[PDB]
Amino acid sequence: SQLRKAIGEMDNQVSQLTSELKFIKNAVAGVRETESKIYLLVKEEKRYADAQLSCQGRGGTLSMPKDEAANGLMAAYLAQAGLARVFIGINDLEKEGAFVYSDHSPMRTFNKWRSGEPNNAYDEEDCVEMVASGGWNDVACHTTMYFMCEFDKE
Amino acid sequence: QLRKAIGEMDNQVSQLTSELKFIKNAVAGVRETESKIYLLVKEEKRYADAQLSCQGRGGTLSMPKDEAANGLMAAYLAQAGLARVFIGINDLEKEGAFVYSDHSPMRTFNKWRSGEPNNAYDEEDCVEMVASGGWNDVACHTTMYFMCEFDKE
Amino acid sequence: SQLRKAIGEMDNQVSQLTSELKFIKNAVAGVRETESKIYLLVKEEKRYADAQLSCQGRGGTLSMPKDEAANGLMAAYLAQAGLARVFIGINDLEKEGAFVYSDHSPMRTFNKWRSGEPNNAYDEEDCVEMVASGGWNDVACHTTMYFMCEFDKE
Numbered sequence: 136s137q138l139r140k141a142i143g144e145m146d147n148q149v150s151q152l153t154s155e156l157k158f159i160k161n162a163v164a165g166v167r168e169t170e171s172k173i174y175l176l177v178k179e180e181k182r183y184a185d186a187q188l189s190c191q192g193r194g195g196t197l198s199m200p201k202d203e204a205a206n207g208l209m210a211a212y213l214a215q216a217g218l219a220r221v222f223i224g225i226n227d228l229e230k231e232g233a234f235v236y237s238d239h240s241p242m243r244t245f246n247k248w249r250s251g252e253p254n255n256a257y258d259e260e261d262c263v264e265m266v267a268s269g270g271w272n273d274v275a276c277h278t279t280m281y282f283m284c285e286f287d288k289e
Numbered sequence: 290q291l292r293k294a295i296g297e298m299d300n301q302v303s304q305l306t307s308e309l310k311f312i313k314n315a316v317a318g319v320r321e322t323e324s325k326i327y328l329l330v331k332e333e334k335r336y337a338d339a340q341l342s343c344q345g346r347g348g349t350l351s352m353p354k355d356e357a358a359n360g361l362m363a364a365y366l367a368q369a370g371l372a373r374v375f376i377g378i379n380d381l382e383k384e385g386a387f388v389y390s391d392h393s394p395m396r397t398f399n400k401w402r403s404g405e406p407n408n409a410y411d412e413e414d415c416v417e418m419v420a421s422g423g424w425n426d427v428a429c430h431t432t433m434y435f436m437c438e439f440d441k442e
Numbered sequence: 443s444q445l446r447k448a449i450g451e452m453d454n455q456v457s458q459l460t461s462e463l464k465f466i467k468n469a470v471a472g473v474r475e476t477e478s479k480i481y482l483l484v485k486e487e488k489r490y491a492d493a494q495l496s497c498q499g500r501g502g503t504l505s506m507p508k509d510e511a512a513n514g515l516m517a518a519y520l521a522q523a524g525l526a527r528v529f530i531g532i533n534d535l536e537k538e539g540a541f542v543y544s545d546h547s548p549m550r551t552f553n554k555w556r557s558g559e560p561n562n563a564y565d566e567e568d569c570v571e572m573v574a575s576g577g578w579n580d581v582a583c584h585t586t587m588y589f590m591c592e593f594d595k596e
């Protein structure tokens with residue numbers, strides 16, 4: 136029974152690592168995870184194109200809320216982090232009025248525009264922000280703020 | 290046959306432990322004792338908010354119950370280049386009677402600055418740590434960065 | 443077959459940790475890794491000596507580009523991170539004109555000095571910066587900017 140205890144201690148090591156890893160994910164990086172996706176808040180004030188490049192560098196894109204569950208998760212994430220606004224992956228940069236997600240997939244029936252939005256304010260708003268409530272608002276791409284990236288587990 | 294398989298697994302866990310240790314120390318710049326982990330949160334908050342934030346992370350505001358802990362926190366504060374942070378000490382329930390965040394009572398060990406605690410203007414029921422490592426009572430509604438503490442259960 | 447499943451599940455745990463660890467390295471910390479080394483950008487404006495101390499506290503040193511591959515990696519890292527300049531581990535602090543790496547190992551034939559560099563401008567330039575292009579330039583040690591640390595895998 137020499138290997139028995141070596142392996143018991145091994146189990147302990149793996150348990151330990153799992154716990155510390157979970158800690159790093161939750162307490163430090165404050166990440167958010169679904170069954171199929173990971174969501175990450177980056178607390179660096181940037182402009183839209185810079186943000187999309189930063190998300191891409193991390194091997195992801197700006198977050199795309201295509202359904203209620205995602206959007207609600209993002210809203211909760213924003214809530215706990217205690218922020219008013221972040222960039223997300225929606226824009227009508229190519230064709231004004233025609234909004235699309237960061238991956239170029241077209242806009243659909245689901246949305247979360249705040250009342251009166253999108254309003255293309257001063258004909259200079261082609262990017263999209265999410266606010267505390269979870270609602271969307273179009274804003275100027277040259278605006279600078281924090282952002283959220285989205286990752287596929289593939 | 291099973292021995293070398295186990296050895297190779299040992300190698301894998303060694304590897305993972307090392308990379309994880311790297312992530313903890315070099316990247317996240319956290320601080321670790323044999324039994325505890327300490328984390329600086331650089332978000333300006335009021336005391337109760339800070340404590341809630343620590344709790345949400347499954348911890349509490351840092352409790353320096355001995356010299357080693359306190360000195361560690363002081364060094365951490367030094368490296369981060371900060372003047373003050375909230376820590377887990379208060380006399381919110383009974384004025385003059387200080388306690389740690391986990392409600393465990395105050396002891397002989399302390400690191401009060403000269404003249405502290407002074408309950409300035411009868412509105413100071415929370416505690417800050419400063420660069421030197423000394424303590425000071427301050428108003429709970431004050432807003433600043435804070436330090437959380439985590440047990441390795 | 444009770445032990446079989448416990449072992450299978452532990453295996454799953456180790457695979458899982460491997461993936462999540464890789465994620466934390468790449469997506470969160472945005473580090474760059476070679477077979478033998480890890481490179482880390484620190485986004486805190488500091489002076490050379492402070493930067494070196496910070497790297498040391500992390501158990502490393504300021505980055506040392508001793509060959510073309512390293513230097514090019516550092517350059518790409520800088521580029522994507524969207525930075526103009528960072529400190530690196532090169533200086534002639536001890537003996538003017540005689541440049542050395544942070545680990546005190548002497549300068550060699552390989553270099554990436556910009557045109558006209560190093561020029562010891564106003565006899566007050568004893569530290570080295572890397573710029574977007576990947577080129578080197580000597581600068582005053584009292585200058586404040588971001589820096590890059592380098593780590594051995596042992």
Ligand SMILES: OC[C@H]1O[C@H](O[C@H]2[C@@H](O)[C@H](O)[C@@H](CO)O[C@@H]2O)[C@@H](O)[C@@H](O)[C@@H]1O
Pocket residue numbers: 252254255256260272273274
């Ligand atoms: O900075 C002013 C204001 O800008 C944001 O909203 C702008 C625009 O996108 C809205 O459609 C209209 C409607 O009120 O107002 C602004 O032009 C908001 O995010 C707001 O919080 C911000 O203060």
Ligand SMILES: OC[C@H]1O[C@H](O[C@H]2[C@@H](O)[C@H](O)[C@@H](CO)O[C@@H]2O)[C@@H](O)[C@@H](O)[C@@H]1O
Pocket residue numbers: 527558559561563567573579580581
């Ligand atoms: O703007 C040119 C250059 O300025 C700074 O470099 C200084 C010095 O170190 C250089 O040797 C000389 C070359 O003429 O110029 C300056 O005095 C750096 O900030 C550099 O990035 C910049 O391109």
Ligand SMILES: [Ca+2]
Pocket residue numbers: 231255258259260261
């Ligand atoms: Ca427009």
Ligand SMILES: [Ca+2]
Pocket residue numbers: 227231232255259260261262273
């Ligand atoms: Ca528009």
Ligand SMILES: [Ca+2]
Pocket residue numbers: 252253254255256260272273274
């Ligand atoms: Ca708008």
Ligand SMILES: [Ca+2]
Pocket residue numbers: 384408411412413414
């Ligand atoms: Ca009081």
Ligand SMILES: [Ca+2]
Pocket residue numbers: 380384385408413414415426
């Ligand atoms: Ca008091």
Ligand SMILES: [Ca+2]
Pocket residue numbers: 405406407408409413425426427
């Ligand atoms: Ca006081």
Ligand SMILES: [Ca+2]
Pocket residue numbers: 538562565566567568
């Ligand atoms: Ca000189």
Ligand SMILES: [Ca+2]
Pocket residue numbers: 534538539562566567568569580
């Ligand atoms: Ca010089």
Ligand SMILES: [Ca+2]
Pocket residue numbers: 559560561562563567579580581
């Ligand atoms: Ca120069």
